Amino acid sequence: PKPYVAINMAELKNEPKTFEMFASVGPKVCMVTARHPGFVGFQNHIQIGILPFGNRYGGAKMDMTKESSTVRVLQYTFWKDWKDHEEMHRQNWSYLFRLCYSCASQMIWGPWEPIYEIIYANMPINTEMTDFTAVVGKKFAEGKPLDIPVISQPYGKRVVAFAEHSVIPGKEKQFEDAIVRTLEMLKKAPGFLGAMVLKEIGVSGIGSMQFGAKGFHQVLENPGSLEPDPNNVMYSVPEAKNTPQQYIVHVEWANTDALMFGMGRVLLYPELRQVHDEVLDTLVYGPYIRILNPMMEGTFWREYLNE
Amino acid sequence: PKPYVAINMAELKNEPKTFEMFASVGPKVCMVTARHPGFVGFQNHIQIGILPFGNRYGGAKMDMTKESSTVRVLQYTFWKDWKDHEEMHRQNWSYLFRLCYSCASQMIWGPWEPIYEIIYANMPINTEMTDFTAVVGKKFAEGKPLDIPVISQPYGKRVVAFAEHSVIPGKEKQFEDAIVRTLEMLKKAPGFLGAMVLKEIGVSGIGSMQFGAKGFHQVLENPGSLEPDPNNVMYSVPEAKNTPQQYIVHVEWANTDALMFGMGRVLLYPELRQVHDEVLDTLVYGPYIRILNPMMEGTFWREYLNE
Amino acid sequence: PKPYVAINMAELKNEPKTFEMFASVGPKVCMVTARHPGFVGFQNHIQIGILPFGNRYGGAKMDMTKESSTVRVLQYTFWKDWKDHEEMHRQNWSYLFRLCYSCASQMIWGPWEPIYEIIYANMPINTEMTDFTAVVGKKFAEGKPLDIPVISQPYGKRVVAFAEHSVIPGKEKQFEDAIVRTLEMLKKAPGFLGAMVLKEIGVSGIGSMQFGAKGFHQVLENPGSLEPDPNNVMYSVPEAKNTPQQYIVHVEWANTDALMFGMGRVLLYPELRQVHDEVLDTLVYGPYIRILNPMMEGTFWREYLNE
Amino acid sequence: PKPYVAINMAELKNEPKTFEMFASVGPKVCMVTARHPGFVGFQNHIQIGILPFGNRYGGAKMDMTKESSTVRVLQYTFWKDWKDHEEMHRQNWSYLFRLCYSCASQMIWGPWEPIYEIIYANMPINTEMTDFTAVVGKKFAEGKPLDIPVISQPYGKRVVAFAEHSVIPGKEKQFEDAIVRTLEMLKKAPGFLGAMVLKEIGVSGIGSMQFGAKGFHQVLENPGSLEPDPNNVMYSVPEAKNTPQQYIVHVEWANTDALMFGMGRVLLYPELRQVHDEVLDTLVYGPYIRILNPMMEGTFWREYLNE
Ligand SMILES: [Fe+3]
Ligand SMILES: [Fe+3]
Ligand SMILES: [Fe+3]
Ligand SMILES: [Fe+3]
């Protein structure tokens, strides 16, 4: 079934010390998260660049890692129910706060952790190139060769287009209907590895280190080993839901060229351009497209999705 | 009287060609904006860094200009009525679009142009160090020594704390009352040069290059000398107003140390800390504090303000 | 069905500034071209080299990119009807001229845009290496395993043999019959990815910036933002059709070794050599064989082709 | 059927002279070992690193080869009956001792040669990427598509997780049952190439150069061309079996990322974590996980295994 998604977002200094702490503390945070039975997996991304849209963002390119002074992370965790995320943070707060607080020396912005519902998903399980023979064998044995997926390789061996959209109030249904029609056509582009549409339902104050006064002072004054009062979060998840309504259109691709020309199909192929124009008419903001590398992940999230 | 404020925000590559285009294009844009009789002035900022709050943003410093790969600009224009902003943009679209388009080669994000009402202002006129003798003489000559301002030096000779806040729905009045009480106390800190509170009322689609499908394709396809259809903006300014409600607390300071310890007064001086705690209890997001240099400005906006 | 093909040809300086403008302006031109509902896609090439044919062109090699002072581009656009190409240019001339004129600073020769009919096509859809599993599954589910194509990878991951031929007047049928027999045999060569035969039907004067006197002056005097009169083209497409008749034999290959030995099959395999000798007897000029890299492309042209 | 496994373990200087000895001596030893009809194959490994378990072994990483002063080898030989290994050594002692002695100059620790029974195996035959087309063909031809294996590439083109465990006396059955459940679930991880559990039954004194006094003096005094008395081994294989009982859990993976996150599935996927917790409760020692590269091998051992 469709899980809910929490996306923890932050911007950190682009230096070895940051990647060192990703490698030490990141696994620990994931192990802590996995203590909760409602956790169904994760997909952790680094932003490598920004899609330039010709020269609309002429200062950007799809891979800016060499030049950029910062690194943005977008850490997706998947949950049977979004309340499971809120419970896990609170049940495991002494570990999680002290783990996440160790990233402080490297932080420039964040953490900020919006929560989403998945309103559309066309996403395969991941497979390594070594796996495909057995997958094909099994699908033919089951008499379902139509269910043989594309090869979507895990652990940094594909790329993601993370397309931000905010929608005019009243135009949500028009956006949702048109984006799904768009993505159903998009899937014909070479190197398409799957797509999903995330609709924001709110924000996790605790995941965002956003407390009332007491907890704010506790964060600022922390030696690193003392939890802020987790009951000093002043707002529930839905209270922070944005209007204009926010969506992420998340599309996965074999490589950055497939991403550039494949996402470009919505502009270059007249039939699809006409459908996608119905999306564009509904927007307050976007599409703004970040190029992400899914590096560290728990691929069983897709197994849950496709149950 | 209080003007409305439009703040055009963008992120560009941090390199010489960018600052060269600020020098070419920026003055031209301001001159075009001044064709409208409702224009009352401008204050254009570059972000120099981010307030670290001890080590909460431990990768940040107040001056990050030597290491950052990007530069963020925040261009304030002041208007008798916010509709004047919208009218100026449409009436001068040929010039403005083609001027702003020249910046595309350097752009990474933006433009994004929220519009604000000023709900509180304690801001002086600017004066150079050479002016103060005549100001003092003139105020004493008219029997108004209370109207002698601090010396708030124009053109890059002071610094701004730009503090972003978003507020729990329903707590807008509590925030507003609390922040004004806070700023009325803050004005005792040494080096304090004034403060104002901006409350978002909406977003200029045209200023943000956010059109429907027709205008989006015109933007992406543009050789630089053809206008997108300015009538293809699909939402009004208020239709884009965010909930949670967004505010900017804008506080000016003599220098960055005065800024750090001055804004710090709300954490360090117990009586003020108690008042400011009432602000903190209302927030969804923030305070996140950008450090800005007001470089290019039309100082007469303050003359209008203080009329 | 078989579309028509326009091939825009030019030679430019082989320097970064040329490739910078390909990345900036190329996409804009494609987006403009896609405004016409008769546009069915595109395949844009850079010439990497020339086939030496032993040492017949002993100064050449298949990859000359490191040494060459120029770069030749051959931009294929595909059209339901060739008249569509002519309408598209006229209907969108404001944008298109101004975009293409921005290439001026780098141009040495061109543009020159002959138009072709396809008289023979054996060309597959493109697929990425990730896609093949699903393609195989679908064709078996459909009971059409015979229709499983080779893997012809998009976006610079294969090579093209572009073989120019001109034919003795009166021998066009003999050429056409012999070249098809030849290509039907050539498809056995390892790494063969498809072939088509293009027969020239004329030249687009507008696409070649070839006007009467009035438009010629307008081109030469242009500051960059003023279109020449698109109605000052003095000849229709068919009026410029060459005699001797020109053809392109376009053959795609997995890599340059497969290209060299595979194309060489017409010389090395006696049974094929006998068939291809019938082609050679009909020529005025050729075969002259350029080695091309298909970098930017709209792969959906093959979908139209194969319906 | 399941063979028995002898694992010869040694630590040598990490310098070129060592790898030169591997290249000349190693193939000779394997040829001698092949003189016995009970020899069913071999798989020889170098340790490339150690799994850090987050930062539990924070000084380790998966590939330590550039920094390490030593190199550990783990040479697996597979035997129809374990007694065959013992007989082979005695029958071929003049050659083997003299061959193994020539490694002396490079040795820091070892040799040490425990013998194992295989209590669980899910291991495929190895195939090169060239082979898979024919394997698929044959399996479909015999109506067994379910038996198409993953592609497990020989000769250094995959990696091995070598997980050491020692088990509380009396908890052997619990460990064995829970480890099998764990590996049956682990096989769903991307990149999984097979697993087996080895249970120690004893140690080969002769393979370990572990003699009584007579043979010890002979080894120490050896010019290189005189055998120690092979009848001076003082203990049988089972007499050296350890309590606490030792096991190796040997898991093969496409690459080190698949190994890291895949082995990690036992910590990150809640359903598998619960199962693996049952293994963890049984341990005296471990899991301690060496990362191995299987470079030189006699792949036919898996053919024997899978008959
Ligand atoms: Fe979270
Ligand atoms: Fe504006
Ligand atoms: Fe053309
Ligand atoms: Fe042995």
Short mmCIF file of C-alpha atoms in Angstrom, two decimals, chain A:
data_model
loop_
_atom_site.label_atom_id
_atom_site.label_comp_id
_atom_site.label_asym_id
_atom_site.label_seq_id
_atom_site.Cartn_x
_atom_site.Cartn_y
_atom_site.Cartn_z
CA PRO A 1 0.00 0.00 0.00
CA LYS A 2 1.02 3.68 -0.17
CA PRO A 3 3.16 4.77 2.83
CA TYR A 4 3.36 8.35 4.09
CA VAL A 5 6.69 10.16 3.58
CA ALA A 6 8.65 12.41 5.95
CA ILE A 7 11.41 14.39 4.14
CA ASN A 8 14.05 15.79 6.47
CA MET A 9 15.77 18.63 4.67
CA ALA A 10 18.97 20.47 5.64
CA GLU A 11 21.87 22.38 4.10
CA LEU A 12 25.37 21.70 5.40
CA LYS A 13 28.93 22.86 4.56
CA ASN A 14 30.33 21.04 1.48
CA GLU A 15 33.53 19.65 3.10
CA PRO A 16 34.92 16.19 4.04
CA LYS A 17 33.98 16.60 7.68
CA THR A 18 30.28 16.67 6.62
CA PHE A 19 30.52 13.46 4.58
CA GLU A 20 32.44 11.84 7.42
CA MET A 21 29.57 12.57 9.80
CA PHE A 22 27.04 11.29 7.20
CA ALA A 23 28.93 7.97 7.23
CA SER A 24 29.19 7.75 11.06
CA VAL A 25 25.91 9.11 12.30
CA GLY A 26 23.59 8.49 9.34
CA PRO A 27 23.49 4.71 9.80
CA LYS A 28 22.88 5.18 13.51
CA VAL A 29 19.88 7.43 12.91
CA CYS A 30 18.46 4.85 10.46
CA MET A 31 18.92 2.04 12.96
CA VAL A 32 17.12 4.09 15.62
CA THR A 33 14.26 4.88 13.20
CA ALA A 34 13.92 1.17 12.44
CA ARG A 35 12.99 0.49 16.04
CA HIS A 36 9.42 1.49 15.20
CA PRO A 37 7.24 -1.21 13.59
CA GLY A 38 5.52 1.36 11.38
CA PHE A 39 8.85 2.18 9.65
CA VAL A 40 8.85 0.75 6.16
CA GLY A 41 12.14 2.10 4.77
CA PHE A 42 14.04 5.15 3.66
CA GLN A 43 15.69 6.84 0.73
CA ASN A 44 18.36 9.41 1.54
CA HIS A 45 19.46 11.91 -1.10
CA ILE A 46 22.14 14.49 -1.66
CA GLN A 47 21.35 17.27 -4.10
CA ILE A 48 23.95 17.27 -6.87
CA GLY A 49 22.55 20.15 -8.86
CA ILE A 50 19.62 22.04 -10.33
CA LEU A 51 17.96 21.60 -13.76
CA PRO A 52 18.72 24.86 -15.72
CA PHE A 53 15.63 24.82 -18.05
CA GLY A 54 17.73 25.97 -20.99
CA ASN A 55 19.25 29.13 -19.48
CA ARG A 56 16.29 30.06 -17.25
CA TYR A 57 18.59 29.13 -14.29
CA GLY A 58 21.68 29.78 -16.36
CA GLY A 59 23.94 29.76 -13.34
CA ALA A 60 22.89 26.23 -12.50
CA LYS A 61 23.81 22.89 -13.88
CA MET A 62 22.75 19.33 -13.23
CA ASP A 63 26.01 18.59 -11.37
CA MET A 64 27.33 21.46 -9.25
CA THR A 65 29.11 19.27 -6.70
CA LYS A 66 32.56 20.40 -7.70
CA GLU A 67 31.81 24.14 -7.36
CA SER A 68 29.22 24.29 -4.54
CA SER A 69 30.04 25.46 -1.01
CA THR A 70 27.05 23.63 0.48
CA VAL A 71 25.40 20.25 0.27
CA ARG A 72 21.63 19.86 0.62
CA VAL A 73 20.25 16.57 1.96
CA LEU A 74 16.67 15.29 1.57
CA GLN A 75 16.18 12.25 3.73
CA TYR A 76 12.92 10.37 2.98
CA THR A 77 11.52 8.02 5.63
CA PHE A 78 8.45 5.94 4.83
CA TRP A 79 5.71 5.10 7.36
CA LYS A 80 2.59 2.98 7.44
CA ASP A 81 0.82 5.94 9.04
CA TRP A 82 2.35 9.40 9.47
CA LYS A 83 1.61 9.32 13.18
CA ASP A 84 4.14 6.46 13.37
CA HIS A 85 6.88 8.99 12.47
CA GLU A 86 5.78 11.30 15.32
CA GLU A 87 5.64 8.42 17.79
CA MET A 88 9.06 7.10 16.75
CA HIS A 89 10.73 10.48 17.33
CA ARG A 90 9.22 10.81 20.74
CA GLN A 91 9.74 7.19 21.87
CA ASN A 92 13.42 7.42 20.75
CA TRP A 93 14.08 11.08 21.49
CA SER A 94 17.17 10.70 23.74
CA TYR A 95 19.06 8.78 21.04
CA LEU A 96 17.72 10.77 18.07
CA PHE A 97 18.23 14.25 19.46
CA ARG A 98 21.79 13.43 20.53
CA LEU A 99 22.59 11.82 17.15
CA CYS A 100 21.10 14.65 15.03
CA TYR A 101 22.51 17.33 17.26
CA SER A 102 26.04 16.04 16.42
CA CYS A 103 25.58 17.39 12.85
CA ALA A 104 25.36 20.92 14.29
CA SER A 105 28.91 21.94 13.58
CA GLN A 106 28.22 21.51 9.86
CA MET A 107 24.67 22.96 9.55
CA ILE A 108 23.77 26.15 7.70
CA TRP A 109 19.95 25.68 7.42
CA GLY A 110 17.48 23.10 8.75
CA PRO A 111 16.41 20.65 9.75
CA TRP A 112 12.98 21.15 8.19
CA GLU A 113 10.76 18.05 7.95
CA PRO A 114 7.50 18.28 5.97
CA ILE A 115 5.23 15.25 5.85
CA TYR A 116 3.50 14.03 2.67
CA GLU A 117 0.87 11.71 1.43
CA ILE A 118 1.53 9.80 -1.77
CA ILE A 119 -1.34 10.54 -4.21
CA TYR A 120 0.17 8.72 -7.18
CA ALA A 121 2.93 6.13 -7.41
CA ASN A 122 4.42 4.23 -10.30
CA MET A 123 7.62 2.94 -8.63
CA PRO A 124 9.48 -0.38 -9.13
CA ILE A 125 11.48 -2.39 -6.65
CA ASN A 126 15.20 -1.73 -7.01
CA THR A 127 17.47 -4.37 -8.53
CA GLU A 128 21.21 -4.60 -9.10
CA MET A 129 22.41 -5.57 -12.60
CA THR A 130 23.24 -9.01 -11.14
CA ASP A 131 19.63 -9.60 -10.11
CA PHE A 132 17.80 -9.26 -13.42
CA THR A 133 18.18 -12.82 -14.66
CA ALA A 134 16.49 -14.25 -11.56
CA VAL A 135 13.73 -11.58 -11.71
CA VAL A 136 12.95 -12.43 -15.32
CA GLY A 137 13.03 -16.19 -14.54
CA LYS A 138 10.58 -15.75 -11.63
CA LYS A 139 8.15 -13.57 -13.60
CA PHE A 140 8.03 -16.05 -16.51
CA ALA A 141 7.54 -18.95 -14.03
CA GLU A 142 4.59 -17.04 -12.53
CA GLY A 143 3.20 -16.37 -16.00
CA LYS A 144 3.49 -12.58 -15.55
CA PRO A 145 6.19 -11.23 -17.96
CA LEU A 146 4.30 -7.95 -18.14
CA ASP A 147 5.30 -7.38 -14.48
CA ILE A 148 9.07 -7.54 -15.31
CA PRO A 149 10.32 -4.10 -14.17
CA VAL A 150 12.97 -1.79 -15.46
CA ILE A 151 16.33 -2.07 -13.78
CA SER A 152 16.40 0.63 -11.09
CA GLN A 153 19.77 0.29 -9.42
CA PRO A 154 20.18 1.13 -5.79
CA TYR A 155 22.83 3.04 -3.82
CA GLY A 156 23.81 6.03 -5.97
CA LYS A 157 23.45 4.29 -9.40
CA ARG A 158 20.56 6.37 -10.69
CA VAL A 159 19.29 9.90 -10.42
CA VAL A 160 16.17 11.75 -9.23
CA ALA A 161 14.31 14.82 -10.50
CA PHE A 162 12.70 16.48 -7.46
CA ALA A 163 10.20 18.94 -8.91
CA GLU A 164 8.70 21.46 -6.49
CA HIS A 165 5.22 22.85 -7.22
CA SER A 166 2.87 25.14 -5.30
CA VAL A 167 -0.70 25.37 -6.53
CA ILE A 168 -3.28 28.16 -6.73
CA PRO A 169 -5.96 27.62 -4.05
CA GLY A 170 -8.98 26.05 -5.79
CA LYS A 171 -6.87 24.50 -8.51
CA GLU A 172 -5.67 21.45 -6.54
CA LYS A 173 -7.91 18.97 -8.31
CA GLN A 174 -6.96 20.32 -11.74
CA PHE A 175 -3.27 20.00 -10.83
CA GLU A 176 -3.64 16.48 -9.48
CA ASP A 177 -5.59 15.24 -12.50
CA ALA A 178 -3.20 16.77 -15.01
CA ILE A 179 0.01 15.72 -13.32
CA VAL A 180 -1.13 12.12 -13.23
CA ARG A 181 -2.02 12.28 -16.96
CA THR A 182 1.43 13.78 -17.54
CA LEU A 183 3.28 11.12 -15.60
CA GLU A 184 1.31 8.33 -17.30
CA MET A 185 2.63 9.66 -20.63
CA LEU A 186 6.11 10.41 -19.30
CA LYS A 187 6.76 6.83 -18.53
CA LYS A 188 7.46 6.18 -22.27
CA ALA A 189 10.70 8.22 -22.14
CA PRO A 190 13.88 6.15 -22.33
CA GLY A 191 15.51 5.54 -18.96
CA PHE A 192 12.36 6.32 -16.96
CA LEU A 193 12.65 4.49 -13.63
CA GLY A 194 9.42 5.50 -11.92
CA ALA A 195 7.50 8.46 -10.55
CA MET A 196 5.36 9.51 -7.59
CA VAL A 197 3.47 12.56 -6.49
CA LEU A 198 3.79 13.75 -2.90
CA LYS A 199 1.23 16.11 -1.42
CA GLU A 200 2.17 17.97 1.75
CA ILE A 201 -0.06 17.28 4.76
CA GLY A 202 1.91 19.17 7.34
CA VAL A 203 5.25 19.58 9.10
CA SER A 204 6.87 17.71 11.94
CA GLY A 205 7.87 20.29 14.53
CA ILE A 206 9.93 17.79 16.45
CA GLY A 207 11.78 16.63 13.29
CA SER A 208 12.32 20.33 12.49
CA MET A 209 13.70 21.19 15.95
CA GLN A 210 10.89 23.76 16.13
CA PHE A 211 9.82 24.08 19.79
CA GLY A 212 8.22 26.78 21.87
CA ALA A 213 10.46 29.07 23.97
CA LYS A 214 11.56 26.39 26.44
CA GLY A 215 12.74 23.92 23.87
CA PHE A 216 14.34 26.67 21.73
CA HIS A 217 16.54 27.72 24.65
CA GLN A 218 17.34 24.04 25.38
CA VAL A 219 18.50 23.52 21.79
CA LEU A 220 20.63 26.68 21.78
CA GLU A 221 22.16 25.94 25.20
CA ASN A 222 22.74 22.22 24.59
CA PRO A 223 26.15 20.66 25.38
CA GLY A 224 24.94 17.80 23.10
CA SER A 225 23.80 15.30 25.75
CA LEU A 226 20.61 16.82 27.17
CA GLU A 227 17.24 16.41 25.36
CA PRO A 228 14.99 19.41 24.80
CA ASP A 229 11.47 18.81 26.23
CA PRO A 230 9.76 16.95 23.34
CA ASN A 231 6.38 18.03 24.76
CA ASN A 232 7.32 21.66 24.02
CA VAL A 233 6.38 21.31 20.38
CA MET A 234 3.48 23.77 20.06
CA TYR A 235 1.82 22.61 16.85
CA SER A 236 0.48 19.42 15.36
CA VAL A 237 1.56 18.19 11.98
CA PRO A 238 -1.51 19.38 10.04
CA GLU A 239 -1.45 22.86 11.64
CA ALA A 240 1.73 23.59 9.67
CA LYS A 241 0.36 22.45 6.31
CA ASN A 242 1.01 25.16 3.72
CA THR A 243 -1.51 26.99 1.59
CA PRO A 244 -0.75 27.46 -1.30
CA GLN A 245 -0.71 23.70 -1.38
CA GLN A 246 2.73 22.17 -1.93
CA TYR A 247 3.56 19.06 -3.97
CA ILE A 248 6.73 17.22 -4.95
CA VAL A 249 6.80 15.44 -8.29
CA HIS A 250 9.51 12.82 -7.84
CA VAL A 251 10.76 11.19 -11.04
CA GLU A 252 13.65 8.70 -11.26
CA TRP A 253 15.94 8.24 -14.25
CA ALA A 254 18.85 6.05 -15.47
CA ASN A 255 21.21 8.99 -15.76
CA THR A 256 21.27 12.76 -16.01
CA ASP A 257 20.95 12.86 -19.78
CA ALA A 258 17.85 10.67 -19.67
CA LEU A 259 16.58 13.00 -16.94
CA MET A 260 17.23 16.16 -18.96
CA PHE A 261 15.65 14.95 -22.23
CA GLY A 262 13.10 12.72 -20.52
CA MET A 263 11.68 15.45 -18.27
CA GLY A 264 12.07 17.64 -21.41
CA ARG A 265 9.56 15.41 -23.20
CA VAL A 266 6.81 17.51 -21.53
CA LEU A 267 8.12 20.50 -23.54
CA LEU A 268 9.40 18.79 -26.74
CA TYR A 269 6.66 16.26 -27.62
CA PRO A 270 3.52 18.22 -28.72
CA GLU A 271 0.97 15.67 -27.44
CA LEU A 272 2.53 15.64 -23.95
CA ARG A 273 3.21 19.41 -23.95
CA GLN A 274 -0.50 20.02 -24.37
CA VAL A 275 -1.31 17.86 -21.30
CA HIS A 276 1.48 19.33 -19.22
CA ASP A 277 0.26 22.87 -20.03
CA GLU A 278 -2.77 22.06 -17.86
CA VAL A 279 -0.33 21.58 -14.92
CA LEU A 280 1.47 24.82 -15.57
CA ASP A 281 -1.74 26.84 -15.56
CA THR A 282 -2.43 25.90 -11.93
CA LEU A 283 0.85 26.97 -10.34
CA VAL A 284 1.83 29.69 -7.93
CA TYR A 285 5.45 28.48 -7.87
CA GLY A 286 7.52 26.12 -9.93
CA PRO A 287 8.35 23.80 -11.47
CA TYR A 288 11.76 24.13 -9.73
CA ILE A 289 13.79 20.94 -10.21
CA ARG A 290 16.56 19.71 -7.97
CA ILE A 291 18.77 16.87 -9.17
CA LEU A 292 19.28 14.30 -6.49
CA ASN A 293 21.48 11.25 -5.88
CA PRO A 294 19.71 8.50 -3.85
CA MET A 295 22.84 7.27 -2.04
CA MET A 296 21.85 5.55 1.19
CA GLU A 297 18.54 3.72 1.10
CA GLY A 298 16.43 0.93 2.54
CA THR A 299 14.97 -0.47 -0.65
CA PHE A 300 12.33 -2.57 1.07
CA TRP A 301 10.16 0.55 1.12
CA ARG A 302 9.25 -0.29 -2.43
CA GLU A 303 8.33 -3.82 -1.41
CA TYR A 304 5.76 -2.34 1.01
CA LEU A 305 4.53 0.05 -1.67
CA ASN A 306 3.95 -2.72 -4.22
CA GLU A 307 2.27 -5.21 -1.79
#
